[PDB]
Amino acid sequence: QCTVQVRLELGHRAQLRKKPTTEGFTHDWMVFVRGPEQCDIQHFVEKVVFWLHDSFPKPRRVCKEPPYKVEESGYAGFIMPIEVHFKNKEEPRKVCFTYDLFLNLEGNPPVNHLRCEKLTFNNPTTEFRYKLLRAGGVMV
Numbered sequence: 001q002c003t004v005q006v007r008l009e010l011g012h013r014a015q016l017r018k019k020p021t022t023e024g025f026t027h028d029w030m031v032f033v034r035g036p037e038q039c040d041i042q043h044f045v046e047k048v049v050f051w052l053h054d055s056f057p058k059p060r061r062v063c064k065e066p067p068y069k070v071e072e073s074g075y076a077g078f079i080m081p082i083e084v085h086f087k088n089k090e091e092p093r094k095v096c097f098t099y100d101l102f103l104n105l106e107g108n109p110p111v112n113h114l115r116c117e118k119l120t121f122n123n124p125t126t127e128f129r130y131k132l133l134r135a136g137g138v139m140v
């Protein structure tokens with residue numbers, strides 16, 4: 001018996017483009033998944049999948065190594081499914097978040113937002129428990 005907690009940070013940045021794109025997109029934005037300072041989530045994250053709006057081509061964006069991030073231009077915010085796939089052999093294999101990707105509108109300063117997620121793994125296998133603790137996971 002034991003439980004291991006690890007921390008994830010999902011976030012995004014958005015600002016007006018000085019010059020809109022050829023499509024006339026108003027904003028540059030960037031969405032990421034990272035660990036807190038001095039934590040290496042690569043130890044237990046196999047890959048992160050960023051499910052972009054259907055407008056963007058190849059909207060399935062995969063980061064298999066850090067940095068787990070996507071940079072694009074846009075005209076409006078949307079709901080971005082983000083899938084964090086674990087280096088786990090048993091369940092759960094992944095965790096899904098629906099990320100609120102919103103833009104700074106009507107001359108508000110740039111957007112720079114962070115969403116902190118705590119994952120609780122009950123009775124992980126030996127192999128996966130090492131990866132969690134190597135990433136800076138803590139037993140409770």
Ligand SMILES: CC(=O)NCCCC[C@H](N)C(=O)O
Pocket residue numbers: 025053055056073074075076077078079
């Ligand atoms: C590039 C860009 O801005 N794409 C559109 C994103 C918003 C789509 C719409 N508001 C929706 O939520 O489906």
